[PDB]
Design a protein around this ligand. Structure first.
Ligand code: ZNH
Length: 153
C-alpha cells in the first residue's frame, strides 16, 4: 500500500511522461527489447524492425507504446483502486498474449530506466521508490488475476 505522498510523486512524474507518451513508449520498448531480447518474440509484427532507427520509424510500434502507457497511466491514477481497469488487461495478457510476470518486471525496469534518463530532476530516490512501489502493486495484483484465470504467472 502506498502513502498519499508516494502517489503524489508517482503522478507528478507521470505528468511528465504525458508530455510525450509516444516518445517515452519508444524508448521503453527499445530498452526492453535490447535488455531482455526474449521479450521481442511476443511481437510478431515487430520482428523485421532490426535497428534502432527502424524501431523509431515504425508507426505500428509507436502506437503500441501509446496504447500500453495509456492503460498504465490510467491504472496509476486510480492509486491502487484499479480492479476494474486491471481485469481486462489480466484477461488478454493471461489468456491471449501469454506474458509472464517476469516480463512485467523487465518492462517495469525499462520504465524506470527511461524516466530516470529523461526526468532525473523529478525522479530522485523517493520518486523512484514510489514508482517502484506502484509498479510492484500493479504486478502483485495482475499476478493474482492471472492465477484466477488459470495462468501460472
Ligand atoms: C506496463 C505493462 C503493460 C501494459 C499496461 C500493457 C497494456 C497493453 C494494452 C492496453 C494492450 C492492448 C489491449 C490488449 O490487452 O490486448 C496490449 C496488447 C499487447 N500486449 Zn501488453 N502491456 C504491458 C506489458 C507487456 C509486455 C511486457 C509484453 C510483451 C513482452 C506485452 C505484449 C502485448 C502484445 C503482444 C499485445 C498485442 C499487440 C497487438 O497484437 O497489436 N505487454 N497490452
Amino acid at each position: 500500500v502506498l502513502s498519499e505522498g508516494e502517489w503524489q510523486l508517482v503522478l507528478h512524474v507521470w505528468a511528465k511522461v504525458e508530455a510525450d507518451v509516444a516518445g517515452h513508449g519508444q524508448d521503453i520498448h527499445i530498452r526492453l527489447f535490447k535488455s531482455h531480447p526474449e521479450t521481442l518474440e511476443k511481437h510478431d509484427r515487430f520482428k523485421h524492425l532490426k535497428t534502432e532507427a527502424e524501431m523509431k520509424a515504425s508507426e505500428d510500434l509507436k502506437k503500441h507504446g501509446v496504447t500500453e502507457l495509456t492503460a498504465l497511466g490510467a491504472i496509476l491514477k486510480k492509486k491502487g483502486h484499479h480492479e476494474a481497469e486491471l481485469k481486462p488487461l489480466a484477461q488478454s495478457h493471461a489468456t491471449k498474449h501469454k506474458i509472464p510476470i517476469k516480463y512485467l518486471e523487465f518492462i517495469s525496469e525499462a520504465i524506470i530506466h527511461v524516466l530516470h534518463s529523461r526526468h532525473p530532476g523529478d525522479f530522485g530516490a523517493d520518486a523512484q521508490g514510489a514508482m517502484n512501489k506502484a509498479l510492484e502493486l500493479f504486478r502483485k495484483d495482475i499476478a493474482a488475476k492471472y492465477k484466477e484465470l488459470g495462468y501460472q504467472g
